[PDB]
Design a protein around this nucleic acid. Structure first.
Lengths: 87, 85
DNA sequence: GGGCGGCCGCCC
DNA sequence: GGGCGGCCGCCC
């Protein structure tokens, strides 16, 4: 079971496990916020690439938490949705 | 803003609008449950086609209510998810 | 077959 | 450059 309200979230992407730090995601998509067991750090899109989902081009859908895409956590109030980078 | 708890729901797909009848949707995906203003009836997938989204092959995402896919209303307990065939 | 994950064109 | 709607192959 996963506590969606906790400041740290266990996440997965393509069978790769990591720990998402909400305090870091809140600083923006360019900030490394996911740490794998070996201590390495990833931004969300870097973690999408790590899990083999580079071609999907959507970390909010490629990265999952408790069997839900991160977008579902954002829609349900468990996870801040970081701002877009303007064009 | 849409009352997602109403038995009749205004839905859209592409430029097309219609009213989704929840009690008809409950019965299954082959049942006609969306009526347009001329009185014609559509299943969800027929309404997907009518709105120009034939190639999406996912009426739960192509058909919208209040800006949300119907899938969202199902995930949040406002709409029956008809049984899979 | 019905529909969903993988993909990527395209806008902003 | 980022990410979402449109597309479609392919499980069950």
């Amino acid at each position: 079971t996963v506590d969606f309200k906790a400041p740290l979230l266990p996440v997965t992407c393509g069978g790769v496990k990591g720990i998402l730090h909400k305090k870091k995601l809140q600083q923006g998509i360019l900030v490394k916020c996911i740490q794998t067991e070996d201590g390495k750090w990833f931004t969300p899109t870097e973690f999408e690439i790590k899990g083999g989902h580079a071609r999907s081009k959507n970390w909010r859908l490629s990265v999952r938490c408790g069997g839900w895409p991160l977008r579902w956590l954002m829609e349900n109030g468990f996870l801040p949705d970081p701002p877009r980078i303007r064009y």
